[PDB]
Scaffold this active site. Structure first.
Site, mmCIF file in Angstrom:
data_model
loop_
_atom_site.group_PDB
_atom_site.id
_atom_site.type_symbol
_atom_site.label_atom_id
_atom_site.label_comp_id
_atom_site.label_asym_id
_atom_site.label_seq_id
_atom_site.Cartn_x
_atom_site.Cartn_y
_atom_site.Cartn_z
ATOM 1 N N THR A 1 -31.074 12.963 -10.265
ATOM 2 C CA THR A 1 -31.892 12.092 -9.431
ATOM 3 C C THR A 1 -31.409 12.153 -7.992
ATOM 4 O O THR A 1 -30.249 12.471 -7.719
ATOM 5 C CB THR A 1 -31.862 10.644 -9.892
ATOM 6 O OG1 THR A 1 -32.669 9.857 -9.000
ATOM 7 C CG2 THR A 1 -30.439 10.148 -9.885
ATOM 8 N N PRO B 1 -10.401 0.201 34.076
ATOM 9 C CA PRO B 1 -9.652 -0.968 34.564
ATOM 10 C C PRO B 1 -8.160 -0.954 34.262
ATOM 11 O O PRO B 1 -7.440 -1.795 34.816
ATOM 12 C CB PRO B 1 -10.340 -2.126 33.855
ATOM 13 C CG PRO B 1 -10.835 -1.510 32.576
ATOM 14 C CD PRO B 1 -11.283 -0.129 32.942
ATOM 15 N N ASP C 1 -4.579 6.135 43.691
ATOM 16 C CA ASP C 1 -3.979 4.950 44.312
ATOM 17 C C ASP C 1 -3.308 4.064 43.264
ATOM 18 O O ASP C 1 -3.188 4.428 42.089
ATOM 19 C CB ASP C 1 -5.012 4.143 45.106
ATOM 20 C CG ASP C 1 -6.324 3.984 44.374
ATOM 21 O OD1 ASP C 1 -6.518 4.635 43.332
ATOM 22 O OD2 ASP C 1 -7.172 3.210 44.852
ATOM 23 N N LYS D 1 -1.453 1.822 48.650
ATOM 24 C CA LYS D 1 -0.576 1.155 49.599
ATOM 25 C C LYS D 1 0.838 1.035 49.045
ATOM 26 O O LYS D 1 1.093 1.234 47.858
ATOM 27 C CB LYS D 1 -1.121 -0.231 49.950
ATOM 28 C CG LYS D 1 -0.707 -0.743 51.326
ATOM 29 C CD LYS D 1 -1.307 -2.109 51.607
ATOM 30 C CE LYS D 1 -0.904 -2.597 52.980
ATOM 31 N NZ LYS D 1 -1.317 -4.002 53.189
ATOM 32 N N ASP E 1 -14.702 1.739 38.413
ATOM 33 C CA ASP E 1 -15.871 2.569 38.709
ATOM 34 C C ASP E 1 -15.917 2.911 40.201
ATOM 35 O O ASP E 1 -15.702 2.037 41.054
ATOM 36 C CB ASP E 1 -17.186 1.858 38.300
ATOM 37 C CG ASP E 1 -18.404 2.755 38.407
ATOM 38 O OD1 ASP E 1 -18.869 3.021 39.530
ATOM 39 O OD2 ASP E 1 -18.901 3.219 37.366
ATOM 40 N N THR F 1 -16.106 -0.598 35.063
ATOM 41 C CA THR F 1 -15.657 -1.464 36.142
ATOM 42 C C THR F 1 -14.830 -2.627 35.581
ATOM 43 O O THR F 1 -14.804 -2.889 34.383
ATOM 44 C CB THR F 1 -16.836 -1.993 36.955
ATOM 45 O OG1 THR F 1 -16.340 -2.553 38.182
ATOM 46 C CG2 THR F 1 -17.582 -3.071 36.180
ATOM 47 N N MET G 1 -11.692 -9.171 44.133
ATOM 48 C CA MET G 1 -10.830 -9.362 45.303
ATOM 49 C C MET G 1 -11.046 -10.741 45.913
ATOM 50 O O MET G 1 -11.409 -10.884 47.080
ATOM 51 C CB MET G 1 -11.065 -8.286 46.364
ATOM 52 C CG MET G 1 -11.018 -6.863 45.875
ATOM 53 S SD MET G 1 -11.474 -5.718 47.188
ATOM 54 C CE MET G 1 -13.244 -5.938 47.234
HETATM 55 N N1 LIG Z 1 -7.242 -4.354 35.725
HETATM 56 C C1 LIG Z 1 -7.786 -5.307 36.449
HETATM 57 N N2 LIG Z 1 -7.661 -6.628 36.064
HETATM 58 C C2 LIG Z 1 -8.251 -7.621 36.827
HETATM 59 N N3 LIG Z 1 -8.957 -7.288 37.977
HETATM 60 C C3 LIG Z 1 -9.066 -5.987 38.341
HETATM 61 C C4 LIG Z 1 -8.488 -4.963 37.599
HETATM 62 N N4 LIG Z 1 -8.761 -3.772 38.209
HETATM 63 C C5 LIG Z 1 -9.493 -4.042 39.318
HETATM 64 N N5 LIG Z 1 -9.681 -5.405 39.399
HETATM 65 C C6 LIG Z 1 -10.420 -6.162 40.412
HETATM 66 O O1 LIG Z 1 -11.081 -5.238 41.238
HETATM 67 C C7 LIG Z 1 -10.590 -5.335 42.561
HETATM 68 C C8 LIG Z 1 -10.397 -3.926 43.117
HETATM 69 S S1 LIG Z 1 -11.726 -3.355 44.219
HETATM 70 C C9 LIG Z 1 -12.824 -2.578 42.983
HETATM 71 C C10 LIG Z 1 -12.142 -2.004 41.748
HETATM 72 C C11 LIG Z 1 -12.892 -0.901 40.983
HETATM 73 N N6 LIG Z 1 -13.797 -0.161 41.863
HETATM 74 C C12 LIG Z 1 -13.655 -1.486 39.789
HETATM 75 O O2 LIG Z 1 -14.764 -1.035 39.473
HETATM 76 O O3 LIG Z 1 -13.178 -2.418 39.124
HETATM 77 C C13 LIG Z 1 -9.316 -6.163 42.499
HETATM 78 O O4 LIG Z 1 -9.237 -7.067 43.566
HETATM 79 C C14 LIG Z 1 -9.485 -6.985 41.254
HETATM 80 O O5 LIG Z 1 -10.178 -8.159 41.592
#
Ligand SMILES: Nc1ncnc2c1ncn2[C@@H]1O[C@H](CSCC[C@H](N)C(=O)O)[C@@H](O)[C@H]1O
Ligand SMILES: Nc1ncnc2c1ncn2[C@@H]1O[C@H](CSCC[C@H](N)C(=O)O)[C@@H](O)[C@H]1O
Ligand SMILES: [Cl-]
Lengths: 451, 447
Positions: B44, B225, B248, B270, B299, B327, B374
């Site tokens: 089957t 992240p 960075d 930095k 991202d 992101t 930020m």
């Molecule tokens: N691992 C993490 N945990 C918490 N906040 C994070 C993070 N990585 C990035 N961020 C946030 O993202 C900011 C970076 S500027 C943009 C980050 C990146 N382009 C993205 O897409 O996330 C930081 O000030 C913080 O607020």
């Protein structure tokens, strides 16, 4: 696929090589290591055949091709410099349904011989099938660096332990957790390579003694928006180990080819929400590894909350792997960055249709310095055009619809706000609506394709 | 070696599966992908078989096992639950010399079916002879990470291109250098996947024209992240193939430990460096014919100034592409069990930064999820303004620091406590505002 790879057991099965030169020697060495009962039939033989026959390892037949010599065989290799002879060999193997190889003719005959990476009993086979031999060696050599030396010993000891693992653990789930711990134990690998038996046993005894987790689990995996390369590593590990994969319309066929072939797949497209809840909850009851595979990210308009909300209380362990949301994917592949300097100070991810009643707060959506991204808003395009203009948004504000973003069927149509209605007619689900000045950046940042 | 691996051409060849359940269905799919002329013998069938039989894709024979169905066959598979039947099938094929597999049993079979990586015509098959099927699964996972989906496309194109690889390359050594920049030129790969047969030529002759040591392109890649698992496959493939990686602080060391060891690294974040120097470094190291990878947290196109870095390169005619990433919002939402949307809680998610000024009444409107990137510094004045503009003072708030990483801190509570809670964290952190933050007490699976 253009070939099906299989791993033949050649011990005590007859095979014929026809031809007797440097090529024929290489293939004959391969078949001898695999324990085959070999006959070489050629007009003349380089010395290596002469010595092999002295030690009683193959049978030599000096003369032209003898078809009857196939009658007992499981594999034939044609290996002469005469195409006319090679084809007669291939034609005799075909009438007898014997897989045949022709060294000069990868596209004729029945099987191809791949490059081999030996870590016996571990074997990796590579072949581009004749189109690219350069990529074969390039891949072969790269693979040679990734697989350790001692991988053979781990694998040999795994088979010896396979009987003990089947008597001691009852179900399939707990044998799996045993083997996952076993193969990532670097100490156990060095102890085998150092032939240190007291240390092999000590680690082996502790492993058999660990309590194993009998529970199932559910993992929400974000599949990303479509391109199979945008899946995350973690998300590949989940669907390469999953027992059941519950997937829907918005997961592509390229992503689904990455699921473990021996897992079962349940479709949930066109099924409502409370059913998906229960089918997940039901398939996790068997204590299996359930993957819920969702397009995009699972917490951006995928109702991943509704699914996991059941299981915090039903005592089921769960977790979530995030995915590339359609917004991030469509922006990178349309040339339209979601932020940029102070074109936009914020980005809004918005739904296209609400819970029957309730109106979108158009006053809020109309604000300046933001990129707008409408999910499943296609059928409401015309009203978004009206309302946005009603609440202050300019008329020549650029817009873009990204249909099927990140795939090879990606269409992008663009324009200004007053064209939003007619742009939607020449697109179909699944589509995204982007609104804002970042859309103008497209004609400088489009790297994907002119459709 | 006690198994010899061969790659069989099964198109239009009679192959037999005995059994009609789930395991047969997985072997039938496998053999159907490869073009077998397939028959299936069983007492089957599960519905999926009756479907395939109606689309004319194979043949069903209901009943007991008939060894005459093997009369014109090239491969056989036992895939029933009855060892007596499987043993009968196994024995019917050995006297006919048909290669045969017993799913239940690697031993007592003339062939084993390995794990496969398909990139046709390119194929990779992994087995260890029945000793360690989990270890082969692990090898298959890793290999799927490493091989681009569209490698087969470029595999094929290399085929009728070996013509030209001699009348424009004399030595076998340079011949291989070309071949090496060929299979890694993803701009050619995407061009072939997308059938754009003019992007294909423009890059085919750029490959024969530009000097052999020049492979100059830029790839913007999202690191995600922080968790190395949250990188993408294409992202990983790209940082395996990079001549230089420009990165960075916001890129985690776990991600950097994935970058090829024999590759230049420029630290650009930095210490305790404006945007335009980063632009010049990228421009500079790309004009030298080096394959550049710009690695960015999260991202690239969400507050990463990804746009700025790519309009420096569009001037000079430098190919580029973007591999997006997770992101921070997505990650932190998932690894803290705070979904950005849920039911009718929120009609929209707002990702916002912390010249010009932020529009305050907009941020207070109900039916939103606010995510502040930020914003730890401006956190004091944010609680003031939202209260001043009418947001309910019991609106849940959460700050997620080092999201998705093995040192992630989450701090939650109520909007009235917003200023107090922002001292308790440090960059990088996310401020999340809205009613979905109340869901963490049921959804937090990380801590
Ligand atoms: N691992 C993490 N945990 C918490 N906040 C994070 C993070 N990585 C990035 N961020 C946030 O993202 C900011 C970076 S500027 C943009 C980050 C990146 N382009 C993205 O897409 O996330 C930081 O000030 C913080 O607020
Ligand atoms: N590849 C794609 N291209 C354009 N739009 C897409 C898309 N994939 C999903 N969408 C949009 O997403 C809607 C479903 S809501 C689920 C999406 C998921 N939350 C995510 O993060 O992506 C669809 O109606 C469609 O509008
Ligand atoms: Cl194995």
């Amino acid at each position: 696929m253009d070939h099906l790879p299989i791993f033949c057991q050649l011990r005590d099965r007859d095979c014929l090589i026809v031809g007797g030169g440097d090529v024929a020697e290489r293939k004959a060495r391969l078949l001898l290591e695999a324990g085959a009962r070999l006959t070489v039939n050629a007009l003349t033989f380089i010395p290596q055949f002469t010595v092999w026959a002295n030690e009683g390892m193959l049978t030599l037949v000096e003369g032209p091709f003898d078809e009857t010599l196939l009658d007992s065989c499981w594999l034939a290799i044609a290996a002469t410099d005469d195409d006319t002879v090679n084809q007669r060999v291939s034609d005799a193997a075909e009438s007898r349904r014997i897989f045949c190889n022709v060294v000069a003719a990868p596209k004729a005959a029945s099987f191809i011989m791949p490059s081999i990476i030996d870590r016996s009993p571990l074997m990796v086979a590579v072949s581009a099938g004749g189109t690219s031999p350069v990529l074969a060696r390039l891949l072969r050599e790269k693979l040679e660096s990734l697989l350790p030396q001692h991988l053979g010993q781990v694998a040999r000891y795994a088979g010896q332990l396979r009987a003990r693992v089947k008597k001691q653990f009852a179900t399939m789930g707990e044998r799996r957790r045993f083997w996952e711990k076993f193969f990532v134990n670097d100490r156990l690998a060095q102890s085998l390579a150092n032939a240190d038996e007291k240390a092999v046993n000590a680690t082996t005894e502790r492993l058999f003694s660990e309590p194993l987790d009998h529970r199932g689990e559910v993992v929400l995996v974000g599949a990303g928006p479509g391109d199979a390369g945008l899946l995350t590593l973690k998300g590949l590990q989940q669907i390469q180990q999953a027992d059941i994969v519950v997937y829907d319309r918005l997961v592509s066929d390229d992503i689904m080819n990455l699921v473990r072939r021996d897992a079962d797949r349940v479709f949930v497209g066109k099924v409502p929400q409370e059913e998906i809840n229960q089918i997940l909850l039901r398939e996790a009851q068997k204590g299996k590894r359930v993957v819920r595979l969702k397009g995009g990210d699972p917490f951006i308009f995928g109702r991943g909350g509704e699914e996991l909300e059941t299981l915090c209380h039903a005592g089921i362990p769960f977790s979530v792997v995030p995915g590339i949301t359609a917004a991030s994917g469509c922006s990178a592949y349309s040339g339209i960055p979601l932020t940029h300097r102070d074109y936009a100070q914020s980005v809004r991810l918005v739904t296209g249709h609400l819970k029957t009643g309730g109106e979108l707060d158009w006053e809020n959506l109309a604000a300046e310095k933001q990129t707008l991204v409408f999910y499943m808003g296609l059928n409401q395009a015309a009203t978004i055009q009206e309302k946005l203009i009603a609440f202050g948004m300019q008329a020549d504000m650029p817009v873009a619809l990204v249909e099927n973003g990140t795939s090879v069927k990606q269409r992008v149509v663009h324009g200004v706000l007053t064209q939003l209605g007619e742009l939607a007619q020449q697109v179909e689900s699944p589509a995204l609506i982007i609104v804002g000045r970042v859309v103008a950046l497209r004609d400088k940042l489009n790297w994907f394709s002119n459709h």
